[PDB]
């Protein structure tokens with residue numbers, strides 16, 4: 198089997214991407230944030246505290262003939278950005294882009310943190326990291342990809358995120374029309390439950406490439422590119438008037454700037470992030486200070502190849518017995 202779904206930026210900055218997902222019988226379509234950095238599929242629901250719902254579409258398990266309470270199971274998750282959610286669990290039929298899984302754990306939120314409530318465009322998350330990170334207790338649950346894998350034509354999914362445009366998530370096949378050149382594959386560690394890999398180095402603009410190992414995760418659920426402070430300082434040093442602002446919480450730059458590109462290495466291959474991809478717009482409405490798309494990971498404890506990086510590539514998440522990542526230009 199295969200599936201193919203379009204993913205759409207939630208706003209003009211690409212702060213996140215939403216992908217429609219069919220849950221239940223008859224289908225209830227929710228717009229979920231596909232997150233290769235977490236492993237829970239959770240939704241706003243008829244159980245969510247009413248004051249914490251503001252415009253999201255909810256899953257109502259009592260209206261699905263295939264929904265079953267997963268008795269005793271609860272979940273609770275805290276993300277790296279400080280946001281959180283928790284609740285109970287149903288199993289139900291979940292389809293993405295024509296690919297159906299029966300008996301998928303659908304984690305129903307009873308509580309969500311303010312940043313979820315305040316984002317009316319995201320109806321929940323669909324985790325695509327390794328199932329070892331799933332938070333359901335006392336019986337850990339599998340991701341949608343892990344449940345689908347055996348049925349897929351190839352045990353893979355691909356992320357093709359757009360810059361200020363829609364893109365695609367495919368499951369079970371590699372669309373050879375969607376990228377240029379060849380795909381370079383690189384090793385993955387699953388030891389922390391993430392799609393963790395080692396980049397071979399970086400360049401700033403037309404500068405020389407620096408060969409250096411940068412361990413990090415491929416995380417579609419993180420907006421920005423988070424790298425070591427040395428690398429980030431080298432990038433922003435090429436932008437007149439850029440500075441790290443403790444008050445704003447990262448590097449800012451004059452909105453009048455033309456940003457340089459940023460290149461990262463994948464083995465002997467190179468992915469180029471155009472400068473425009475690194476502009477996240479005014480820090481507040483009407484400001485002439487703009488927020489940078491490359492930020493330090495020093496406060497995180499891991500480097501994160503988020504959407505800024507991933508949207509410059511066609512990315513293969515290879516879930517073979519030994520997982521690997523693939524990157525191609527496009």
Ligand SMILES: NCCNC(=O)c1cccs1
Nearest residue numbers: 230276278280312313418
């Ligand atoms: N801070 C806004 C609410 N949190 C989110 O939208 C998340 C997306 C992916 C991981 S957390």
Ligand SMILES: NCCNC(=O)c1cccs1
Nearest residue numbers: 209210452453476477478
């Ligand atoms: N240098 C121009 C300031 N940047 C912007 O207005 C936007 C960034 C992303 C969408 S608009």
